[PDB]
Amino acid sequence: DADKLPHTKVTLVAPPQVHPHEQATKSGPKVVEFTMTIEEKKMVIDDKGTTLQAMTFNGSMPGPTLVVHEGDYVQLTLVNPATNAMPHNVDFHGATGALGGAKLTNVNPGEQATLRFKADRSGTFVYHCAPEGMVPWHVVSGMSGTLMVLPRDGLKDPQGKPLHYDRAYTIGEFDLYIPKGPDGKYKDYATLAESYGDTVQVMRTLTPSHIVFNGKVGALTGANALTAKVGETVLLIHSQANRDTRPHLIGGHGDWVWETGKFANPPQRDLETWFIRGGSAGAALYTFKQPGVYAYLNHNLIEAFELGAAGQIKVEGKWNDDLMKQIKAPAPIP
Amino acid sequence: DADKLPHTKVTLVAPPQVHPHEQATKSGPKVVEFTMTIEEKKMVIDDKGTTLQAMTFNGSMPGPTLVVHEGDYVQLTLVNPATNAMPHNVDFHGATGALGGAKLTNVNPGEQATLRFKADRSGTFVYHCAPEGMVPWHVVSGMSGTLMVLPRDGLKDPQGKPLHYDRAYTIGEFDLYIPKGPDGKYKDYATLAESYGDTVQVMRTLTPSHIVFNGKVGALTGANALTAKVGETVLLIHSQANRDTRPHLIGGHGDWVWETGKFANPPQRDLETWFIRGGSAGAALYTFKQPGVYAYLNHNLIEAFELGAAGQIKVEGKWNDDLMKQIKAPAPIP
Amino acid sequence: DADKLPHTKVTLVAPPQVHPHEQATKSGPKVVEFTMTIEEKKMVIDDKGTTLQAMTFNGSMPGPTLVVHEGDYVQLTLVNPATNAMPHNVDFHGATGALGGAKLTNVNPGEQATLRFKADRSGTFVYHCAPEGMVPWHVVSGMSGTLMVLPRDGLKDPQGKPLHYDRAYTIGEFDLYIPKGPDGKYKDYATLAESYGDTVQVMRTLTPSHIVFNGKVGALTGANALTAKVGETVLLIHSQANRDTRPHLIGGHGDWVWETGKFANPPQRDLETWFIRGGSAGAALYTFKQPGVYAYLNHNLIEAFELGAAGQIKVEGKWNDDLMKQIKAPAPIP
Ligand SMILES: O=N[O-]
Ligand SMILES: O=N[O-]
Ligand SMILES: O=N[O-]
Ligand SMILES: [Cu+2]
Ligand SMILES: [Cu+2]
Ligand SMILES: [Cu+2]
Ligand SMILES: [Cu+2]
Ligand SMILES: [Cu+2]
Ligand SMILES: [Cu+2]
Ligand SMILES: [Zn+2]
Ligand SMILES: [Zn+2]
Ligand SMILES: [Zn+2]
Ligand SMILES: [Zn+2]
Ligand SMILES: [Zn+2]
Ligand SMILES: [Zn+2]
């Protein structure tokens, strides 16, 4: 019975980081308490100044990643401030019943609610807003993120041997549908409500204007690149709440990958490219063996390089000539 | 030798139901006999009165699901009445040889044929019409369904333990390509033949005008919702003969899923969203634990809510506060 | 240490063939040496005379398949003749570090370089050109192929039992983005450089004008059909460096399939249709049981029959009435 369990309180952190947590643990089940506050805002999503009338959990795309263990109960307080214009809610794919909790968390601006559900299944799961009649709009405008439910004894390989990560990053990939006017320029809307009708028209074409990691072209590049060192294992959590994507690490691999994102299933190894189904979150482990700047992208290379679905990981350490060596540098042909 | 085996005769039923059958069985192999009659007809596919010049097996989209056991022989009589305008045939993905049987079942209006093949592989398999030179048109106009070949000893989990369903539903998802005229309204064609050239032009854009379960927007919603009770296991058979989709049960999961649809492979568990490749049928088991109305949809939410790829399952029984509880209902913020 | 190993030299062959190689082998690791020469050229890609300003490894789309064993080192010499206009390089998904080798193989026209990397992971892996700032263009214009890294003891089934192929074919599937002018005809460009800006515009729509196997509509059909005999096992290597596809053998199956293409993972059996993620190569084994002409295609049937993604395999041998029999030929209805 959940009433008798100890309660713990978790402080969320902004993507691409993930809040401190244990993997394998000796702890018994808890009611883990989180709070998120919805923020509607206009956001600049590319280098040329295009805006999106956006909607977010906790001010970021994606929302923050919530982490518990299998057997825990998630208890979320969802706050919709009066400064917002729209009603909202939350649908946890990791939860059982009531349209993922959507039916029990309908909050108008100035309202809040508290949902509890049992995280009885391990994996990365999408959570997203789902107000009746406007579900796709809320999702594609930015209202999604990941619940990671770790097995109580940590991750396991196909033979039941222990797996771990030394650092976790969360990447949300957003297919955006920004309208254009008669002049072929992207439209800038004074309010969220005014963007709706034009946006639905773009949505129905099924062609994104932009596809971005973490809310904007270049969000995870240059100074905002992910980081690691040779010998460190990274978990890359990839969520896509609306559309398929195909993650790849250039110069790397998915050492162990759960592309459907459910940890009770054996992972696949040595992947070049994996597949996240629209409406899901997946997870890949990789241990870096070479230093340098890696690209982490959607391997529809148009979607990556033209439309925005690409980032970087800057990796420190010592080059390894056994794994790779320039035998003869570029030089004239004999 | 198939000539020495007992023959049985099966009466098909309309989707979303599936005809009575055994899962695990003590029976030896049989020649199982079915008959289907092709019906070309104009069908209303949405709420605003849009029509499709459709083609069907047995008058429905999808065609009915045929169920046998591994080692059985399927013996289909395919009837093409003289009231039809086009030639037709059938390609069983579950069969070996002759383009799935297409080469041996070419039937002009007023003709019929009888095909036999050995169902030597377990799984859900697409069957579809495939006349030379017009294959995509016949498929996207509605001529597909599922052959389910159960293992003789029933479904099994990754550890070889028994799995079962208490009820089976079949869902066919149809990407439609309805042309529009200069006024931006959908075209209404007097005959099947007249729809062809305009439709091929829409097809080549790769953008469906509509994507529907079972032949129309809302076919599996409201009064036509699927049904179940808490404690019952449902098999959800999902076919898509032309285009990828990503099934999800809102507030539920795929407890055991064969997304490529082939039962000799271990299923995956705890899926939020699975993937049916265009040209295949997949299958998911789920045991309901909460009552209420669930949505079962393609989790490209545009494809679902805007274009039509969504239905409902109405589930009876007792709410379970351990799995989910509204701790604090929506109420003003402190 | 790679310097102490024996060097071997391999002569590449044109797709759809694959160069002679061993599967299971008693040989220890080698440094296997290959050379490829880039050729930019205009190519006719369909029946109506449409051209593509193409870019290739070794004059073909796809490039040739390179085959080694796990533990070998690949040592490629990449030649960019002075007759080419653009700089190029190579990114091996099978390699670790330096953006797959791209950073160490930047070659202007008239230059060459030699890369070595350790093929420490078994599977089929994409290789492709990846010049900074122009990656998608080089890829979609034809610069990709497959590195197959076989396990030293050959392929294995889920229970660790031996698998083999008697013949291997390599199929590269290319989503092309050919621009049109104001008259609705495809544009013909005098040079590679001139095609760029118009092509990027088509790319950004995400709608291919054509999707072809091995560089052109019908490349693997009629006289250029693949061949086999009843009782022979074929390996079908399928690469797609930019966009998803869904291979299917009409009248056949994937007997054992590694759709993510990584041989240390158990294969799936009895597949009707499998899924190659954009940015990957997959592999399927099939043993023919019936003679006749099979179609091997992308089972988005529009992509196959309308846009070009389909070929044929002509199979010799004796028909098998147990697997399939025309019980009653097409004939009038009673
Ligand atoms: O593997 N570079 O897209
Ligand atoms: O999980 N609701 O799309
Ligand atoms: O299975 N014929 O597309
Ligand atoms: Cu919302
Ligand atoms: Cu959802
Ligand atoms: Cu037909
Ligand atoms: Cu088919
Ligand atoms: Cu190049
Ligand atoms: Cu790549
Ligand atoms: Zn915990
Ligand atoms: Zn570590
Ligand atoms: Zn039977
Ligand atoms: Zn039951
Ligand atoms: Zn070798
Ligand atoms: Zn053999």
From TrEMBL, chains A, B, C:
Residues binding Zn(2+) 3 are H69, D72
Pathway listed for it is:
Nitrogen metabolism; nitrate reduction (denitrification); dinitrogen from nitrate: step 2/4
- Keyword check for Metal-binding: yes
- Pfam families annotated for this entry? Cu-oxidase, Cu-oxidase_3
**Which positions bind Cu(+)?**
H88, C129, H138, M143
Listed binding positions for Cu(2+) 1 are: H88, C129, H138, M143
InterPro entries of this UniProt entry? Cu-oxidase-like_N, Cu-oxidase_2nd, Cu-oxidase_fam, Cupredoxin, NO2-reductase_Cu
Q: How is the cofactor bound?
A: Binds 1 Cu(+) ion.
The record lists Cu cation as bound by H88, H93, H128, C129, H138, M143, H299
Metal-binding listed as a keyword: yes
Q: Which family does it belong to?
A: Belongs to the multicopper oxidase family.
Query: What is the designated name of this protein?
Result: Copper-containing nitrite reductase
Species annotation: Alcaligenes xylosoxydans xylosoxydans (Achromobacter xylosoxidans)
